Amino acid sequence: HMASMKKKGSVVIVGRINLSGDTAYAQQTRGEEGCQETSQTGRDKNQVEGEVQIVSTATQTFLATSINGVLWTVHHGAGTRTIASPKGPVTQMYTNVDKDLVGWQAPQGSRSLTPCTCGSSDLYLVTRHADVIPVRRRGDSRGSLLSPRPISYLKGSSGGPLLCPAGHAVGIFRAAVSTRGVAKAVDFIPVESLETTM
């Protein structure tokens, strides 16, 4: 009934994939109890850094990537949820279920990737465990893993980036193409779609 209807919580930044140095590693910035509280209030005063965030809802965890001043992720993780911020919940500025894409204004302190203009097909996928996986681009929205992996290895990495050799954003990881539980290829949202959305 009306008076007791609940609201979904906010997406919460719980960590980041550190790519700044010579070693890529995942960093946690908030534990599970703090995550749950922050999702409910939508108020997150933690400092944000970096290009790739680890994000969570009450039920899922995935990645989000800043490109051109927007923190982008997948709709199948975020839905229409707000993101927690120092001043309270922030509404999505982009939502496109057809592309599986959402975005919010990038948090203060984040750094953004630049869309790739290289026209090159040797790519790198960054996972939530900070693995950097070589991917050969095979079409507008597909690339093949040079070394196939069980889907377990990729689960929770949607929203993360595919990058070119120079570290530009080429796309956002969306789905794994798997046969018998092995991912031989990935599907991604090309950066040009994000640029058109903007």
Specify whether the CB–CB gap between 72 and 162 falls below 8 A: no
Q: Is residue 195 close enough to count as binding Zn ion by CB under 5 A? A: no
> Would the annotation count 75 as a binding residue?
no
Residue 167 Cβ, how far from Zn ion at the closest point, in Å? 7
Residue 42 Cβ, how far from ligand TSV at the closest point, in Å? 20
The yes-or-no answer on residue 156 being catalytic is yes
Number of residues that bind ligand TSV (CB under 6 A): 20
Q: Is residue 9 close enough to count as binding ligand TSV by CB under 6 A? A: no
Q: Is residue 76 close enough to count as binding ligand TSV by CB under 6 A? A: yes
Q: Is residue 26 close enough to count as binding ligand TSV by CB under 6 A? A: no
Would you say 74 or 163 has its CB closer to ligand TSV?
74
The yes-or-no answer on residue 121 being catalytic is no
Catalytic: which of 10, 100, 103, 160? 100
> Would the annotation count 35 as a binding residue?
no
Choices 33-41, 63-71, 167-175, 184-192; region in contact with Zn ion by CB under 5 A: 167-175
What are the backbone angles phi and psi of residue 75, rounded to the nearest 5°? -65, -30
Environment class of 4 (CB within 10 Å of its CB; exposed 0-12, middle 13-18, buried 19+): exposed
Would you say 118 or 132 has its CB closer to Zn ion?
118
Active site residues: 76, 100, 156, 158
